[PDB]
Design a protein around this ligand. Structure first.
Ligand SMILES: NS(=O)(=O)c1c(F)c(F)c(SCCO)c(F)c1NC1CCCCCCC1
Ligand SMILES: [Zn+2]
Length: 257
């Protein structure tokens, strides 16, 4: 039942998912002035050389690019993390207009979209068990602004026409997610949650400071996707973002300056 509309959208989620009002919900606004520089934070280590993408799927809420995570192929480590976290999928959240679409905000600024690369802590053996643990997941979030095209996104954008409606999927091999990163790996980090139901409080959030640029043509193609399934009334897949939630009793740490 949950979704992103007036009747089932973020302000309703708490009724099925009481943790919506919990103590470590995501996303948040990143107050860049109150984020504490922490010289003990390590460089983030992003090892995507061996990533094996499998499939791309429209689930009715967003689209997911899935990876084979049955061995240590694409991993995130260091940064604020202990251990090794395996990439399982990436997805995006975006707006009906370029002035909104990101879930995290930076001194209240919305970006056109936000990419989330979702990784799970290999000490919990699989993703289902990891989401039940307070350090189960590390999600790397990257802002998108509109300007020049991102060449390494085009393969994603071109296949979207083939997964237009809910439940459609396509083969999606040999996609390299290093094509989606910006130059710098400076980050903020905080303890938070999934941003969609079940809203589990299991995420170490790592949000890059530097956005990537994507073209208006690229983001426009995102907005041509549908929330409905084939042969239902067209509801464009836009504004699939959860707004900033109360920071509460949490500190956002910066890797830089
Ligand atoms: N937004 S997020 O990065 O915190 C996030 C996770 F980290 C998750 F681990 C999950 S669990 C599903 C894994 O495929 C999740 F749904 C989302 N959110 C969903 C966003 C909207 C569209 C539904 C598709 C799955 C991602
Ligand atoms: Zn997300």
């Amino acid at each position: 039942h949950w979704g992103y509309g007036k009747h089932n959208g973020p302000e309703h989620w708490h009724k099925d998912f009481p943790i919506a009002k919990g103590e470590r919900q995501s996303p948040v606004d990143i107050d860049t002035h109150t984020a504490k520089y922490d010289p003990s934070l390590k460089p983030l280590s992003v090892s995507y050389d061996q990533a094996t993408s499998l499939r791309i799927l429209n689930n009715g809420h967003a689209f997911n690019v899935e990876f084979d995570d049955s061995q240590d192929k694409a991993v995130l480590k260091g940064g604020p993390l202990d251990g090794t976290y395996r990439l399982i999928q990436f997805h995006f959240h975006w707006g009906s207009l370029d002035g909104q679409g990101s879930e995290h905000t930076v001194d209240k600024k919305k970006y056109a979209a936000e990419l989330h690369l979702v990784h799970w802590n290999t000490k919990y053996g699989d993703f289902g068990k990891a989401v039940q643990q307070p350090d189960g997941l590390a999600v790397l979030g990257i802002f998108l602004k509109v300007g020049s095209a991102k060449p390494g996104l085009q393969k994603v954008v071109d296949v979207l026409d083939s997964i237009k409606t809910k439940g459609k999927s396509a083969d999606f091999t040999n996609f390299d997610p290093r094509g989606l990163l910006p130059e710098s790996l400076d980050y903020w980090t905080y303890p938070g949650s999934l941003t969609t139901p079940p809203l589990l409080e299991c995420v170490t959030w790592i949000v890059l400071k530097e956005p990537i640029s994507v073209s208006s043509e690229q983001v426009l193609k995102f907005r041509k996707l549908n929330f409905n399934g084939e042969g239902e009334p067209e509801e464009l897949m836009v504004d699939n973002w959860r707004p900033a939630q109360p920071l509460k009793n949490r500190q956002i740490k910066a890797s830089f300056k």
